[PDB]
Symmetry: C4
Subunit: 224 residues, 4 copies
């Protein structure tokens, strides 16, 4: 086992640094430096680069699922056992919370902006709201599967990069609609700290489903 403990550990750590890092960026802009639509590129970028860094950091040591939906679609595709996975998601979930609170600790007088409150922002009926998240986790999910799976026409890019990029695109587009949570873990860490789960289930339902279909289509209908 024990070798596994390191994996769960790396995983707990990767999440904490990411949320702390990412959310910190959304908040950071939440300052008095004339908040502009530029915040979007900046936020989007930070998340996109944080993950690439994280896969770079613990991607080999833990696999790099670092996402409820990703860790979930993994099990259904059948990779990380039903049992071992639950810890993954839990290490992630704490990592979400811990790295978030400590972040909260750093800038308590400007965090109000949310501290990473991924809550169906655009005022559109849950379905239409959840749909966006549905598709994105999918594309992200898909990218990871596509890029990382075994046996390919031999690609020349950084597996570590595209995912960041998928994230990249993910935010740029999804940010205003649903907040582009596209990761239960990251959304969850702030929800414990804000004390508000405005339709939190939406983040588990969409991303997980968006997680399953992409992982599936690749396995089934796309590559036997």
């Amino acid at each position: 086992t024990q070798a596994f403990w390191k994996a769960v550990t790396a995983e707990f750590l990767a999440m904490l640094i990411f949320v702390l890092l990412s959310v910190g960026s959304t908040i950071n802009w939440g300052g008095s430096e004339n908040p502009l639509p530029v915040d979007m590129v900046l936020i989007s970028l930070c998340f996109g680069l944080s993950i690439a860094t994280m896969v770079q950091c613990f991607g080999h040591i833990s696999g790099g699922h670092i996402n409820p939906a990703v860790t979930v679609a993994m099990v259904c595709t059948r990779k990380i056992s039903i049992a071992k996975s639950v810890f993954y998601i839990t290490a992630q979930c704490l990592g979400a919370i811990i790295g978030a609170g400590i972040l909260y600790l750093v800038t308590p007088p400007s965090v109000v902006g949310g501290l990473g409150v991924t809550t169906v922002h655009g005022n559109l009926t849950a379905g239409h709201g959840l749909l966006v998240e549905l598709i994105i986790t999918f594309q992200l999910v898909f990218t990871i599967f596509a890029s990382c799976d075994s046996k390919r026409t031999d690609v020349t890019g950084s597996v570590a990069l595209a995912i960041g990029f998928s994230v990249a695109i993910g935010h740029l587009f999804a940010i205003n609609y649903t907040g582009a949570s596209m990761n239960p873990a990251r959304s969850f860490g702030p929800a414990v700290i804000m004390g508000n789960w405005e339709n939190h289930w939406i983040y588990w339902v969409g991303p997980i489903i968006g997680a399953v279909l992409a992982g599936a289509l690749y396995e089934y209908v796309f590559c036997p």
Copy 2:
């Protein structure tokens, strides 16, 4: 055949996600977050990263033409048969429409900004307007051919990346002139939905011609 069906399929899907993704970005900025010239980098970037993601996603499974002009220059260079190609463009064309409408469905109260209305914006006589598109599809077209063709001094970069980048540059520069459509498929999906084809032919004429010359110069005059 059937193996082919997957290819047409991947292709239909790649386009839908891209337009939905890309256009969504142009619109998304179309909010009340002080619209600035920053929109440009953001838009430009989203498209540039979306494609890289898409080639990453279905680039191997379908080849990654995902563009009337690209799929067209391919046939003239002689790669995808006259017959098989027509479907490619059609899967793309629907994918343009479907992913666009559903996008329309998500943000119906702010889409007005266009929903991706790539229509010769800069008020300059069609020729001067179409010229820009002429050249860009070319450079994009060229990049793909240059980077992807067989036998090279062995490059060290991500084939998946440069194209995104070509896109990248493409928008940054072409956006205000003609809207930088540089892809019949993407332009077309919104045109069905807006109900306006302000000189739509310009997008088929330029990009296709810009498509043919780049693909040609590489084949003929540059690499026998």
Copy 3:
């Protein structure tokens, strides 16, 4: 010979597209979309990505000097003969002019912003003004030499990328001081068209010297 003609040709073409592409970006922002300090990232980025594209496009076919100072430091390092090089610089120089004018042709009513007027902007005595250009062409020059030279600890990045990045950094920083010309060719194409050579020599003197020392230090003092 003739095989060479293609090289000079690719080279003429690469420059034209780059200036047209790059300058177009500086001007493009020169619109009525609330010009902001954001223009910098955008400009910087376009140039940085345009070159990477260009090396990607004609980097193998011509070598990818595409710069008076670069093509010059090459000869002193001794690579492209004294004779063959003069054409290189000339193909580049025309390419600068041709791609620039035609650009001028596209947006004649907003180009006034310069059309790429790389002229010692910051009001600082030529020496202090030329110094900045001195150092940058060097670092760029150096990057190309460092990255591309033969026999290395075997790098894992895109040779095509770093140069773009060197460009990237180059602009971000040098833009306001001297206009970050860092390339005689690109500066020259607009100078013929604006009809003003406000201390044009500064662009040939600095970049060339900045070109020679970097190419030298690598050859001499750094790698025997």
Copy 4:
């Protein structure tokens, strides 16, 4: 020895160009082009790209520690001898100063904005202020160790890139809190020139500690 002299030299040079380059960017924005929160992406980006360039430039010739904390965590991990390292940090430290002053020389009438005054900006008690720096140097430190160390599942990305990216993320997030110094050398060069060390020790204490733990965790608890 002498071969070593080149290493110390490359190292002195890399730092100078980086600070000059990076700080120059923070200041450059310090102009009359409507300073916005966009400055952040721009700054963040310049540093992130400057380093990647620098590792690209002298990363092989000197190893690419180019950071007190990095050069320090290296010795504790045991790589560069106790003796040889002190020079490294010193070449870096001068390089910080020299490249900074000369920068100061270029734009003396607008530098006031700081000239790179990485001083615990956010008004939060040293501990909370130093903490941020603590963690970042770590993640950066970690990335370098993770990416560069020997024997790995064989990565497909640019070792030269991730570090830049770690920098990338680093700034985006840390900039407003502590100024995101995340490098004693870079912070130090301006401190000699501003004549103010507002809690300078914070930059040596945090980054060094953040430097040691990341380098450690990788060596110990993560990879025996």
